[PDB]
């Protein structure tokens, strides 16, 4: 079963003729193709797709460091789930250990291992080429319960394992690694993650993702063709401006024509000849124009249209990648945190972050139990000025001088323990007199009782 | 009956020729077609439709996390229905358990199961291709009353079951799953949800939805045709600029012409020849122009028009997805969304229906297992910074709260000299009442002294 025991079928009921009984083929949407990822691999050098992949992975890479050590607060943090909890002495150390483990991508430091930055760049590339991310989790050999490493794996090699009955295996070796159409490794669901951004209920989708390269493939081909078309003017074209027709009773001999070429080049070529005019006395002379006087690129609008579509599918502004955004160029105003940057982050960048977070939470942190959470966190506008303004209000509303000083680690002072509000002091000054009056009243009552 | 016992007929009175007596066919609007979803499946790879599905699903995905654990408050929450109620000790834990269940899409954690994000993405795709969402509810095998999982199911496989009398079944196995025109499963109303965005009273609609792909189908075909037209210039066309006519008393032999081609290419081709001019002494030479000097795409306006219609049907801005809006960009217009003029309206139009629909399904089908006291809602963020909370309390402490009540609500110890409102007039009042007491005390003591004297 794909997910679990269910009475609705979630896979093709009749076993389709997969090339191998042991794994599910990555069939194209129309089933016209069974080796889709080897098709997509040919586009991994596409300049537009790589410009997108690089801009996204560069943006993501800024978040890879822990926020804990980043004084601006920008980065990631490992946190307790409940916002209301205060972490225990051991919990704070466990959270710091998990952060360090993530940074190092493993228990020990090892310069030969990918950093978390390299891991994130890898899986971003994999999402945007294949829409499939895989990383293996390696447990300690002596203690299978202890996680030691996680390493990203080539998604083109990972396939769903299938039972002899053509059903996808659950509980067993759910995944296999296939190289040269033989199984070179196998994995449980515990040992290998799979992440997909564009899921489908479609039975024949067989649980695989859906690459934007597949959807946009016609556009990419059209792009390639128009680029080659515009380039071939130089590479293969005739740039010849025109034909100089000279005509007389009979054509000149080849010798005559070649020494006419010598007179020409010796009199008119380069800078040296540049402003001289030939005199020629042929019976008639004509020049036939074969090209436009001013050549430029063609199909610019077509290109813009294509790239606008591809950008809309990927969720990126064409102007982010050096194209006009058709229609979108008008307006795009905003306010507030940068007017446009904030929404251009919303478009795409936030989903990718939350996808990475989801993968990490499901696969890694779950080894440590549900009390913790991994989240990326942006900065805050909480400078010393802002914190002092906030506390300047809290000290009217809540905080005595000594509570504030204690929060700074500064010794409480005699004459603290007071709210900085004149009404509070007028109250205490009233109550003091009230106390001294009641003391007098009660003492005089007692003295009267003793007199009687 | 479709809904229930009623004296008005809600279905075609004469049984229409369904392919199978056992289930109602998904007839096309005009009944020109009986396998409509197999038609629509061919459009599921359309780039425009996929751009819409991906943008909407990505927007929805951000709400999938619980608000409880999300410090910006953005996500979903499970809540009591009444705003006036205060949750009991057990209710808070039950709500947290239900939230966790939703996140996990089931009782236990299982990496093999869809997350809520994947579920929402799936059902969004299903709504916009088919206008039909289905997910099965799986109960515990030992206790049929205990829900364990809910899983999204391929809507193209789900059909209404029909009695032998052609009536839609109610109370029994209302639904069947059909694969290869054989029944592979059956379901009660209890076990499978159906949600539809575009209902119709039309008797022959038989309770099925209405896909925008059906309505827009002509536009999608026109789009495909114009795209193929523009592409075929390279793929299949003659790009030939023109014909060089050279003319003399008789045509050259083929050998002569091929060594003329050799003189030409050896003298004029590529960068090497790029600025040389041939001299030719034919009797006459002419060049016939067969194409425009400057080619570009055609029917761009037609494309914009088509996509404008499709966008208007789906409820999305053309300019969200890289097309001109033929409603002028300044005509589209203290806040109601995330910042930015473009996004606020398309946010309203797309998300608020879609979100409220997803909520509707969750509430009717899942939460109803726990009874009506709870409600599921998506929630946006809030403008409740420390500054705003301090401003609010700075007013509440003038209007309501003594220092000690405020501090206690923070869990901070009450202070001697609290229990007072922070207003000078309040203290002047209490100082008055104090003097009043001291006066009445004096009066009463002097009354007592006179009475004892008297």
Alpha carbon of residue A407 to chain centroid: 39
Two structure tokens written together for B29: 């609007």
Residues B348-354: contacts with CB under 8 Å, at least 24 apart: B349/B315, B349/B316, B350/B56, B350/B59, B350/B314, B350/B315, B350/B316, B351/B56, B351/B59, B351/B60, B353/B197, B353/B315, B354/B56, B354/B60, B354/B124, B354/B127
| Opening angle at CA A360, ends A167 and B60, nearest 5 | 80
Q: How far apart are CA B333 and CA B263, in angstroms?
A: 66
Contact A216, A313 (CB under 8 A): yes
DSSP per-residue letters across A62-112: TT-SBSTT-TT--EEEEEES-SS----HHHHHHHHHHHHHHHHTBSS--TT
**Contact (CB<8Å) B406/A398:** yes
Q: How far apart are CA B452 and CA B454, in angstroms?
A: 5
Who among A292, A309, A335 is closest to B47 (CB)? Answer: A309
Contact B128, B314 (CB under 8 A): yes
- Residues of chain A with C-beta less than 8 angstroms from the C-beta of B138: 5-7
> A26: helix, coil or strand?
strand
Q: How far apart are CA A199 and CA A186, in angstroms?
A: 24
Contact A243, B285 (CB under 8 A): yes
Contact A139, A145 (CB under 8 A): yes
DSSP per-residue letters across A133-183: EEEEEEE-SS-TTSEEEEEEE-GGGEEEBB-TTSPBP-SS--EEEEETTEE
Residues A398-402: contacts with CB under 8 Å, at least 24 apart: A398/B406, A398/B407, A398/B410, A398/B412, A400/B415
**Contact (CB<8Å) B185/A7:** yes
Two structure tokens written together for B161: 């079951």
- Helices B352-365, B47-61: crossing angle, 10 deg rounding: 60
Contact A429, B428 (CB under 8 A): no
Q: How far apart are CA B288 and CA A357, in angstroms?
A: 64
Q: How far apart are CA B72 and CA A378, in angstroms?
A: 11
Nearest CA among B178, B122, B193 for reference residue A13: B178
Q: How far apart are CA A106 and CA A97, in angstroms?
A: 11
Number of CB atoms found within 10 A of residue A399's CB: 21
Contact B159, B105 (CB under 8 A): no
Q: How far apart are CA A224 and CA A220, in angstroms?
A: 6
Contact B183, B123 (CB under 8 A): no
Who among A289, A327, A427 is closest to B325 (CB)? Answer: A327
Provide the β-strand partners of residue B106: B149
**Contact (CB<8Å) A4/B157:** no
Nearest CA among A317, A332, A307, A327 for reference residue B326: A327
- Residue A268 burial (CB < 10 Å; 0-12/13-18/19+)? middle
Name every residue whose Cβ is closer than 8 Å to that of residue A35 and which is 6 or more positions away in sequence.
A26
DSSP conformational letter for B114: P
Segment (H or E) for B153 = strand B147-153
**Whole-Å CA distances, A132 to A99, A126, A158:** 25, 6, 9
Contact A356, B61 (CB under 8 A): no
Q: Rounded to the nearest 5°, which phi and psi values hold at B286? A: -140, 150
Question: A443 vs chain B: nearest CA distance in angstroms?
Answer: 15
Q: How far apart are CA B367 and CA B371, in angstroms?
A: 7
**Whole-Å CA distances, B9 to A304, B14, B28, B164, B198:** 55, 11, 21, 17, 20
**Whole-Å CA distances, A225 to A51, A222, A232, B417:** 19, 5, 10, 83
**Count of H-run helices and E-run strands, chain A:** 13, 10
Resolution (Å units): 4.0
Segment (H or E) for B78 = strand B75-80
Chain A with chain B: Cβ pairs closer than 8 A: 301
**Whole-Å CA distances, A7 to B139, B145, B159:** 11, 17, 15
- Residues of chain B with C-beta less than 8 angstroms from the C-beta of A422: 424
Contact B268, B221 (CB under 8 A): no
Name every residue whose Cβ is closer than 8 Å to that of residue B12 and which is 6 or more positions away in sequence.
B203, B204, B206
> B321: helix, coil or strand?
helix
Nearest CA among B113, B390, B210, B337 for reference residue A386: B390
**Whole-Å CA distances, B54 to B131, B267, B324:** 16, 54, 20
Contact A48, A310 (CB under 8 A): yes
Q: How far apart are CA A397 and CA A374, in angstroms?
A: 34
- Helices B300-314, B217-235: crossing angle, 10 deg rounding: 150
Rg over alpha carbons for chain B, rounded to the nearest Å, is 38
Nearest CA among B29, B25, B31, B37 for reference residue B161: B25
Name every residue whose Cβ is closer than 8 Å to that of residue B69 and which is 6 or more positions away in sequence.
A81, A82, A83, A373, B75
Name every residue whose Cβ is closer than 8 Å to that of residue A240 and which is 6 or more positions away in sequence.
A290, A291, B268, B273, B276, B277, B278
- According to DSSP, the β-strands at B175-179 and B182-187 are antiparallel
Contact A303, A324 (CB under 8 A): no
Name every residue whose Cβ is closer than 8 Å to that of residue A371 and which is 6 or more positions away in sequence.
A80, A81, A91
Residue for token digits 């910006």? B72
- Residues of chain A with C-beta less than 8 angstroms from the C-beta of B341: 331-334
Question: Which residue from B minimizes the CA distance to A323?
Answer: B322
Two structure tokens written together for B48: 């425009």
Who among A81, A326, A340 is closest to B69 (CB)? Answer: A81
Contact B378, B355 (CB under 8 A): yes
Alpha helices in B193-351 (DSSP H): 212-215, 217-235, 254-268, 300-314, 341-346
- According to DSSP, the β-strands at B279-280 and A284-289 are unpaired
| Opening angle at CA A413, ends A408 and A417, nearest 5 | 90
Residue for token digits 């033989």? A182
User: What burial letters (b/e) apply to B2-34, b meaning 16+ CB within 10 Å?
Assistant: beeeeeeeebeeeebebeeebbbbbbeeeeeee
Two structure tokens written together for B148: 């364990």
Contact B196, B128 (CB under 8 A): no
Name every residue whose Cβ is closer than 8 Å to that of residue B247 and which is 6 or more positions away in sequence.
B282, B283, B284, B285, B286
**Contact (CB<8Å) B394/A394:** no
Q: How far apart are CA A343 and CA A348, in angstroms?
A: 9
Number of CB atoms found within 10 A of residue A397's CB: 21
Question: Which residue from A minimizes the CA distance to B104?
Answer: A362
Picking from B385, B389, B417, B449 by the largest number of A CB atoms within 10 A of its own CB, the best residue to mutate is B417
**Contact (CB<8Å) B390/A397:** yes
> B136: helix, coil or strand?
strand
Contact A395, A420 (CB under 8 A): yes
Segment (H or E) for B439 = helix B424-453
**Whole-Å CA distances, A24 to A12, A416, B57:** 11, 73, 27
- Residues of chain B with C-beta less than 8 angstroms from the C-beta of A2: 112
- Residues of chain B with C-beta less than 8 angstroms from the C-beta of A370: 109
Segment (H or E) for A375 = strand A372-377
Number of CB atoms found within 10 A of residue B228's CB: 12
Residue B263 assigned ligand-binding role: yes
- According to DSSP, the β-strands at A133-139 and A147-153 are antiparallel
Two structure tokens written together for A29: 């949407």
Q: Rounded to the nearest 5°, which phi and psi values hold at B433? A: -60, -35
Q: How far apart are CA B411 and CA B407, in angstroms?
A: 6
Tally of residues, chain B: 454
Q: How far apart are CA A156 and CA A132, in angstroms?
A: 8
Provide the β-strand partners of residue A76: A66, A376
Q: How far apart are CA B40 and CA B71, in angstroms?
A: 42
Two structure tokens written together for A194: 């799979």
Who among B184, B241, B282 is closest to A13 (CB)? Answer: B184
> A22: helix, coil or strand?
coil
Contact A302, B230 (CB under 8 A): yes
- According to DSSP, the β-strands at A242-247 and A284-289 are antiparallel
């Amino acid at each position: 079963s794909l997910y679990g025991q269910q009475q609705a079928y979630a896979e093709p009921f009749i076993e389709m003729m997969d090339t191998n009984p042991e794994f599910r083929d990555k069939r194209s949407y129309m089933k016209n193709e069974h080796n889709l990822h080897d098709v997509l691999k040919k586009f991994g050098n596409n300049p537009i797709l790589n410009a997108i992949i690089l801009t996204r992975s560069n943006q993501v890479a800024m978040y890879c460091q822990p926020a804990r050590y980043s004084e601006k607060g920008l980065g990631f943090e490992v946190r307790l789930r409940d916002l209301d909890a205060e972490p225990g002495r051991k919990e704070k150390e466990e959270m710091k250990r998990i952060e360090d483990f993530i940074v190092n991508t493993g228990k020990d430091k090892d310069v030969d291992r990918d950093s978390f930055q390299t891991f994130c760049k890898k899986i971003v590339r994999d999402t945007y080429i294949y829409d499939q991310v895989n990383f293996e989790k390696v447990f300690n050999k002596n203690n299978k319960t202890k996680l030691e490493k996680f390493i990203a794996v080539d998604p083109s090699t990972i396939f769903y394992a299938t039972d002899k009955k053509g059903k996808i295996i659950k509980g067993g070796k759910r995944f296999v690694q296939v190289v040269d159409k033989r199984v070179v490794a196998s994995f449980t669901s515990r040992e290998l993650a799979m992440g997909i951004r564009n899921p489908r209920t479609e039975l024949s989708s067989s649980g695989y993702g859906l690459s934007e390269v597949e959807i946009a493939m016609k556009e990419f081909i059209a792009y390639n063709n128009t680029e080659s078309f515009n380039d071939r003017f130089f590479s293969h074209g005739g740039t010849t401006r025109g034909i100089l027709q000279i005509r007389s009773d009979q054509q000149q001999s080849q010798h005559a024509l070649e020494n006419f070429k010598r007179e020409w080049k010796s009199s008119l070529s380069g800078i040296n000849g540049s402003w001289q005019i030939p005199v020629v006395m042929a019976d008639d002379i004509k020049f036939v124009n074969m090209t436009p006087t001013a050549n430029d690129m063609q199909f610019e609008k077509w290109l813009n249209y294509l790239i606008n579509i591809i950008s809309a599918l990927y969720g990126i502004d064409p102007a982010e990648i050096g194209f006009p955004n058709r229609g979108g160029a008008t307006g795009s105003k905003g306010g507030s945190p940068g007017k446009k940057q904030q929404q251009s982050q919303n478009k795409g960048l936030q989903p990718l972050l939350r996808f990475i977070e989801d993968l990490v939470n499901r696969h890694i942190i779950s080894e440590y139990g549900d009390k913790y959470t991994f989240q990326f966190v942006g900065g805050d506008t909480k400078s010393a000025t802002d914190k002092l303004n906030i506390l300047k209000l809290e000290t009217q509303i809540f905080k005595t001088v000594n509570e504030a000083r204690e929060e700074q680690g500064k010794k409480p002072i005699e004459g603290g323990d007071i709210i900085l509000d004149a009404s509070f002091l007028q109250g205490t000054a009233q109550l003091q007199q009230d106390k001294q009056y009641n003391d007098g009243k009660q003492k005089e009552r007692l003295q009267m009782m003793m007199s009687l």
